[PDB]
Design a protein around this ligand. Sequence first.
Ligand SMILES: O=C(O)[C@H]1O[C@@H](O[C@H]2[C@H](O)[C@H](O)[C@H](O)O[C@H]2C(=O)O)[C@@H](O)[C@@H](O)[C@@H]1O
Ligand SMILES: [Ca+2]
Length: 489
Amino acid sequence: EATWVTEKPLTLKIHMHFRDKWVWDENWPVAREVARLTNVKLVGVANRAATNSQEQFNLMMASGQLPDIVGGDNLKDKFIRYGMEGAFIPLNKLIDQNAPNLKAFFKTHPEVQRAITAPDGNIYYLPYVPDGLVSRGYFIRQDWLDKLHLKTPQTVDELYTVLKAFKEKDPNGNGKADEIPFINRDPEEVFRLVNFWGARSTGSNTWMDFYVENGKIKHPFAEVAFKDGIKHVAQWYKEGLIDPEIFTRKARSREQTFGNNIGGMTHDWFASTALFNDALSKNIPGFKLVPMAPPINSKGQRWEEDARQIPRPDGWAITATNKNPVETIKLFDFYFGPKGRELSNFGVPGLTYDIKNGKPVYKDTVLKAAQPVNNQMYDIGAQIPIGFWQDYEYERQWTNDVALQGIDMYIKNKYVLPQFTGVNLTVEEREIYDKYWPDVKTYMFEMGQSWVMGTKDPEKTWNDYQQQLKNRGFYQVMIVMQKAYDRQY
Ligand SMILES: O=C(O)[C@H]1O[C@@H](O[C@H]2[C@H](O)[C@H](O)[C@H](O)O[C@H]2C(=O)O)[C@@H](O)[C@@H](O)[C@@H]1O
Ligand SMILES: [Ca+2]
């Protein structure tokens, strides 16, 4: 082939554990097709039985026996830290000399290059580059609203009334108090409910990210607004308005709850969430899960805190043990060219899509499957958090009119908050970040869960919590973040 990266066939080892559920599979249709076109085959070495992606990275790193490539989600920080320590190689020269598609991408997307550049000026990974503007929105059961003679809730107080009616007034009509008013695939979304009481949960699509307010770097979990907001979330959890299993249910939450007519509301991505209307129309007559404007919060605003993050802190890196870095960067580059981008987005031609009227078009068997197309793509090795360039066209093809109405409502009415795009730490500032932040973040999540579940009272533990943050070096992290912000802006 002319797309061939190397003349002699090459096999590389990739450690890629992602989203706590998936590993790289060389038997994937997409992986097979990429191997054929590039003459480079990636063989997975990650533990498929394991269910903690970050831990698997840690074990691999601690063992000292590195593969050739490491990929996965939420590895940006680890790519940078172990890049500077020499476990991953800088890609700057390799890109410049061997990677025209990446060069042309970075030229036209300077902001992405900046986002993946380490404090030493080196690029240690290639990112998952999403395509699109909005991500998540609120969805509510319109059929339940109508059946209970309720108007769409406009404020937090009105929402409380609605969710209470969902819980107590038997909208599925089976005589049981089985309804769960608010559900979510993502446990972290329970924290986002503090938005209703004028508190942030994250600055970006990255969970528990910092934000900027009036020239000051802040972290959502350290703010007194969070203390007051999480108190309310705890109350709603105690009242059973929030899924008792919100921390545990996870991936198939929508299929379980909406699919069995017990879920009333969620906060999730427009396309896949709205697809549930098509999937459940026969099973649950009248089922209508519609986008809802965010309620007016206690600060008098309608917040959509989440948006697409370009790029994501996801991707892959070349190890120092890799004896074929030139061949590897050319493989990496393939994904940003026309054929590579097509495959990594749409799957395999003849299997999952066809070129029709000069464009990749999903087969009817894919579009009418009543299973979200992104899920379908994962199964065959597409839409995975490698270094690749998402093409929104893939998503447009399975975004229905209900999803479109929601997307357009959110764009036009300006609900989406300005996103935190990070600060440029020096190497010295980064040392403090890498040292303290991971353990602080873990502590924050665990305290957050405790407050929500009612095992700890936020009001009674706040002062000791703050002291613990100090002891764990959180405010040392805040100092370097603010210093970096002051330099950059
Ligand atoms: O579900 C959708 O409509 C969109 O999902 C996006 O994926 C994100 C989602 O949280 C997934 O469950 C997984 O965690 O990956 C997330 C991500 O890639 O940021 C995209 O697949 C988007 O194209 C879908 O339309
Ligand atoms: Ca019921």
